[PDB]
Amino acid sequence: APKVIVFISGSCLFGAISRSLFKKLPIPYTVVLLILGAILGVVASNVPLVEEHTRDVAHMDPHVLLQIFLPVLIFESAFAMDVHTFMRSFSQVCILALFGLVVASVLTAVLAMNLFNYNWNFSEAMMFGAIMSATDPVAVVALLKDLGASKQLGTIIEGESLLNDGCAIVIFNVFMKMVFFPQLTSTVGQNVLYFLQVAVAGPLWGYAVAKVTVFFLSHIFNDALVEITITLAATYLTYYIGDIWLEVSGVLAVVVLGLIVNAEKTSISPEVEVFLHRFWEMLAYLANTLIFMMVGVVVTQKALVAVDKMDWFYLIILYLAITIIRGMVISLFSPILSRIGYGLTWRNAVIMTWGGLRGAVGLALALVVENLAGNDVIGSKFLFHTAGIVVLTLVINATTIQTLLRILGMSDISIPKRLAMAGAVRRIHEGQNRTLNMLKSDRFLADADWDIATAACEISDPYSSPREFADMMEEARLRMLKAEKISYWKQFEHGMLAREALRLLVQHAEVAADEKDQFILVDDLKKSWQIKGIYPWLKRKLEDLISAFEVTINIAIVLNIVPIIMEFQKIEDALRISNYVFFVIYAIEAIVKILHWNKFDAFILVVALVFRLLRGLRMLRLTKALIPKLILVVNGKINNQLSLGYDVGKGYIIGEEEVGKIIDRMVDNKKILRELKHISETGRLQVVKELGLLQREHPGIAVSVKTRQAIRTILNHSRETIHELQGAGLLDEMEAHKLELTVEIKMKRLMNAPSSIPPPPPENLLKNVSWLAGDMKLIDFIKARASLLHFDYGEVIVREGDESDGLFLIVSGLVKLYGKSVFEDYLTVGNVIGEMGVLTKKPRNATVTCETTVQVYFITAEDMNIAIDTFTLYPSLEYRLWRVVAIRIATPLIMEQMAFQGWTQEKVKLHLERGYLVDLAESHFQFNIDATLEDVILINGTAYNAHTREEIRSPCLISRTVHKLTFQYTATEEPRLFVVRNA
Amino acid sequence: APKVIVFISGSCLFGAISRSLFKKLPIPYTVVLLILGAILGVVASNVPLVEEHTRDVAHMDPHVLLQIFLPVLIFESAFAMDVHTFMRSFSQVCILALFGLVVASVLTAVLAMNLFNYNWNFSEAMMFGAIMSATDPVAVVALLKDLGASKQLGTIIEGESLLNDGCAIVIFNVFMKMVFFPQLTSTVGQNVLYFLQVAVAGPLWGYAVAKVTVFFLSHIFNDALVEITITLAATYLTYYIGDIWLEVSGVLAVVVLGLIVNAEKTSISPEVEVFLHRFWEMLAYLANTLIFMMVGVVVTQKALVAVDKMDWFYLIILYLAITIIRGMVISLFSPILSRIGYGLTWRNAVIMTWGGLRGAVGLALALVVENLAGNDVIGSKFLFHTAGIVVLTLVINATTIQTLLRILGMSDISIPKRLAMAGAVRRIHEGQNRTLNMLKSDRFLADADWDIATAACEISDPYSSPREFADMMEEARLRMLKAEKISYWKQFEHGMLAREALRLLVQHAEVAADEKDQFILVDDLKKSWQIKGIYPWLKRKLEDLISAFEVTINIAIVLNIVPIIMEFQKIEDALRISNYVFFVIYAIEAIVKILHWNKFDAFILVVALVFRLLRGLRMLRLTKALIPKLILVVNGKINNQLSLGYDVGKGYIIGEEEVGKIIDRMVDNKKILRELKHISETGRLQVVKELGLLQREHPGIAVSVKTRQAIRTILNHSRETIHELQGAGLLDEMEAHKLELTVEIKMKRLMNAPSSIPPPPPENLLKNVSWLAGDMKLIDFIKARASLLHFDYGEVIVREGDESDGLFLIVSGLVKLYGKSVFEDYLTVGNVIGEMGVLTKKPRNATVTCETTVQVYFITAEDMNIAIDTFTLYPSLEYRLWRVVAIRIATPLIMEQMAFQGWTQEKVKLHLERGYLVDLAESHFQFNIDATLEDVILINGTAYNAHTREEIRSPCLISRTVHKLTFQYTATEEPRLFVVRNA
């Protein structure tokens, strides 16, 4: 009969009761869990049955207590972080946590020695300070999360808490081997080797097991339980093998493992991510509840028999002293912390000083000191002071941190958030009134009690002259920035932006909204796609270094790796039969060099002819095998930075297009309109130029991230198609679940894609043109009459005023399109110049000047004309070319007229892509607009409408007023019309 | 140093490796986990370090092994049931599991005594049979789940497995106290008391703790961790208290607790539902992996030192015999099982015989026999035979159950499922082609490697004359049944149907598609809303039984409940001071009866004046206190049955309306069309009449379920409005998450609603009319000139041909509307008759005849005319009345023209509710349709269109061809127009 089940389940129900009954009160549930543990402990001191239960559970071995409870708490603290904000402010967190922890430990140690009546030496006092300085704020982290601004302060506090806990348990372990378990003597070399081993091989072992865990998690599909199991078992084996089998600091290993697993969260399937977050939260809640209950039981059973009034006075003065010590540490590190890019203000310094809640980590360290001291009074004093100051910090610091956050002014709700929430509440109320008015006129629910329904459905508000020229200029500036933030959020919710690209764009917009007259600039956005660092230099020097028999030699080296460990008995079996006869004399000298890299192999073979030779040969083979894996790793890091830079640039370009489309309704002054459009177009042109040059710098990695984004977009739209087939009732839940399972497996395989897809040849770029597509005869015709031309920097390719003489399929480099439509654009690889010129036979619109070395395909005008005259199938080349250019000319019109209905540009292009050009030669050059046509766009030519009421002669969306188009026929027009037919 | 962490995490990694590498192979991962446990055991027997690890973990105490691993497996088995399909087929599952288990146990016991060379008596042989007959199929259950038809066979197998495992551990525990731990001697009375205690107080204790857990889970909002903590702690404490503190069968308690918690899933939040399902799946996977690893270790360490060739021969012959025994048990219970409504076929009998996979439950029972036997050989033989039969059943039965499901014909994909999946694959393929054609013409992704993208995005197919008059009649019948199934799914997906109502309607349509010429009938659907049973009789007898001082007397009885337990020392403190002086002489005889229910209290007081008296008084007060709680429980059960019946009624009515709307396109023959519409209208009228009578039978419970449905609908549309504020970017993620948190809290509070809302007075029904709404002066006007009339059965309220004389707000009863529009309809409480007649001054359309006793309000025509003439505010009574009747005439037109775009009737009504009647007296009696009007519906009057091209003179949706309406004015028309303006 395991009474551990009784104590664990009773602690679970006591924690559930403490959580449920104490929601409205500001007092935490952990201190009342400590109180309930105190009553259970004195009941156990009276009653012998409860004595048996809490004796076999609460009087637990210290090593099993650490090994069970510390990995869960440390991994949840590392896994609950926003790791990107943690890594952006790694410097402040790191220097504050480590240096403030060590100086607070020394200050608490000398405070204990010069204050406490016990004759503690410096080692026990430093153990006391190591327990003392470990802070676990969770209520403060949640409070700073949900009160809006100063969001980075919460991440600073949480990361500082994680590193404070980790290195506090590290220095606690160092001084606990200094005091309790050994008292050995060693030299300075062994001491510095032990310090090196702990402080370095902690994070290195954690990084190694985290890399193995991430690699194994990335290759697992369609079973969640394996992923959850690997996460839990990897955490527990990391801590156990590091702490026991090695002398590695196991706490830092779990810190690094949790930070890496939270960093590479894309290797896990999203439902498993949600499960893992809630599961580790539940595990840490169980660990905290068990630790607090057992701390209360043992502190009222064993540690409360030696306390005195002097001990209580020491506890009060110690609490005041450690609060003052943390405040002085923060104040004396304030200049160096302010020299980093997120300088702490005095309000944030006060919040970090007062937000130092002690918790279960320090309680567990006091538990293992109390159990390690035995019958000595030092563990009793340790446990009493730690438990009392956890009580004091919890009560006073939680209640006054709510009060003090209210007092400082960091708890106020901002005016745009108030307006947005009030508008959302207004929209909710009109929707509820509309639903009530519909349901009152329902033939089945006509007699529901409507006062009870109206009382149950009430979503209340949770928050309850040249001078005016500058005023409208500023108001238009904030309105532009707000509209850009709405555009960024609209991009994110439609599966376009990444999460980090959203975050960087909205922080840049919120910073730009705070100064006097600046917008979201380009220079502060350049740092997202700044690839420059050690990574491109590594990539180029390793590519310069490189530039089935080899697999057999690598397999032989992998097999001969183990005799190195064997040699480092029949003289070790004749030295493994002379190392397999020198590995069959280096496989007959690599088959006589297959009948500098080979020179090193020849030198190694000469050394073998003349154990260290085996080590040199094995290390040279390992280097020659592991160099391309290092190339793949560097390519992956550049891919990871390049994806974030590309997504930030794409989000800025698309958002500037949205805010330029919706600028006509919002601002009303013409001068402010023209100025804001000028800054918008300047930023858009500069960002598209930088993205083109960044594409040119690394071609293969850019092709890889573009392919990855294309596969993600296609699989997202397949997911929406599966959802809309489910939602229309055509597919049941099980079959749609099977198809969603297939697309999720495909996305997980897309995550582990090659990070450097090699760039296609110009023939492969010529084959994959949109208006070419299939039709292999026409592809062969175009490839037979193609013409690859090479242009250097600065050479003008096309003039603005000359006749349309051919196409330009850009297969290399970046061009610039100066045009007096002033139309400026930077086209890039894969774009075709002059399709409208070669279709409409009109003299050209823009001149094209190279910005780098540009290779293009010159498909001539005569070849294209006889290509139109040659291929006239049901999909004709004329129809495909006019369809491509018709989509291109009709996207800004439907974008302009119906961006007010909340449609993005991508949804506009998907709505346009279902359309078709109509055959005007069929229906006697007149087309009627019945109810089946949704959006009808004229592309080229002149039109007369209805009973010839007026004429339309422009690229324009034909309005609802017009019923019938009649089409005039002359030369040099041959009009086109694009329709969309009713979903 | 806990080596349990090493063995648990190592078993977790080995189970993860065994799951990952063995996905494609049909051999299960549990048998290769047993193999890995065998290798770990032999290297444990060689190496002393692995000997230490597997010694301190695998050689575990039996009681703690049961108490840890059995609750998790039993609770996941009970929680993974579809409990509704389990409850529909409870009879076959219960008699098959119980009686087949006991007769298979006796057959295996006499098989062991008459076969095995060991001199086993009947108690040890019945222990062997109890271990042998416990089956745990999971692979067969999943295989039957994904393979289409015979869905009920998987639920039969799963429920039979759950009850088989539970009662098998029960009889195993009975015979394990018969053999091992005691050998005591007792009488027949104590034996039947022990049997009664186990077999009755198991499920009763499980029901009690399950009811407490469901009650505590229902009152918990806005935390998940509390809910999973309560679930896990309730499971473990139920098993521990039942097995240890009582002699209750703890396995049956966890079975009943899991079945009730899975039955009352609506008390848990849906995210916590998903987390709890995946969490208990993960826990049982960990338990299975640990059990199989430790079984392999102890089998190859201890159980394989006594094996012989005779033991192996006994193992194969025992496996053949127990397969034959299970088949014989199934075949000899086949007639009684066939007499129940889901009769087993020979194919299902063969699948159930061959699907008997032994597993971790029997492995754990053999583990505790082996550890309980000690150095005796009986535990070694037990563990060898059990582990060998688990290996044999796993390998042979899993591979041959796959090939046997293929052979028998139950794995064949049906033709409608094949057509739907192939059509869905075609929609995915055109959507992918459309997205590719869009992305090829993107200015940023123009150079992705498109062959790799097209290769990565391929969602392939997983499944690779009077005679012809009857042919089209049958084809139209299956086409209606398919379209009705589509409508039922569409109703479920928009948050209208319940899950069980979906399942019942779909199963009834699938049954109706199988016979010759039957449709989804009304009589087989009548059993969904058959309230009749013991519950209405209980409700009426308790309501006949009933028909702050009482709280003080109840508190006094609750305080004096404890001296009953004290009396059942100073003579028990003078008998608790004469039972607090007879509870202050029954509180001064209830304050002298406040200066039969009181007669019993007077008799109890006279008895107390003259311990058993105290017991009688306390039991009488307990009866009088918990009578109304019993009526609330009965009301809750009737509400739960009534909600399912009502939801099936609404689903059938709405789906028949959809399939009557879409019958014009589908069915092309006119005679088939008219006949099929006649059957649809007959079913619709019969179901609406039965629902009206069912509303009349229980008024308050019907008002409660209508209020609950109304609150659910309003909160669902508020959730959609929050989501559409999320997608439009007006609200960020945290603010919308706060609003979604509020609406989820409101739905959880809606779940614990009062089960019988009392019916409102007729004044309250008169106040909550849709065209009245607010306007308290108008409410007072109508109430002052209302007239309540009472009509009995059969009396005609309204003639067909007489003049329109007033309104009829039905506040009681059910009416019938015979009309020659043949229009037949049953109106109920809350509907208004004659609004169109009193607005347009026409003679009436239908005659109204009472079907029960009907109370109505006569708002006369003259009073309504002066109400029109009196109130002429900006919302006028004329505008509100015409808006209500305009919605009522305009929903079938908008539903008819635009149901082909996949809009339900509710979305049509919400689209119509945004509209407004235009003031036709303003714009010179002519209205121009610009692009801002979406749908324009004429309501009354005659109309001329555009340049007077034609005339429209009916209720009709004005088409896209019309540009301008000009309106003629004359007496007795005064036309109305309803518009909807652009979202």
Side-chain angles (χ1 to χ4, degrees), chain B residues 2 116 137 145 221 292 621 671 681 739 769 930 973:
Chain B
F116 289 161
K145 194 142 211 203
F221 316 111
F292 270 77
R621 291 292 99 180
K671 171 45 211 163
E681 97 196 12
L739 290 190
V769 182
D930 78 312
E973 281 190 8

Side-chain angles (χ1 to χ4, degrees), chain A residues 311-380:
Chain A
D311 281 48
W312 287 111
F313 154 92
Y314 285 160
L315 172 63
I316 299 297
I317 275 278
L318 165 69
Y319 169 66
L320 286 175
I322 183 179
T323 305
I324 286 173
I325 273 168
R326 185 174 167 87
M328 289 162 1
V329 159
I330 272 295
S331 297
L332 85 83
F333 269 53
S334 178
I336 308 144
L337 261 48
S338 63
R339 284 322 95 73
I340 310 143
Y342 197 65
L344 286 191
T345 65
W346 90 265
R347 319 187 187 276
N348 306 322
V350 159
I351 291 302
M352 291 205 58
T353 288
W354 206 254
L357 262 72
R358 305 305 178 272
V361 164
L363 282 187
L365 300 196
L367 265 164
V368 309
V369 167
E370 156 77 78
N371 202 280
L372 260 182
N375 41 353
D376 204 2
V377 83
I378 168 182
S380 305

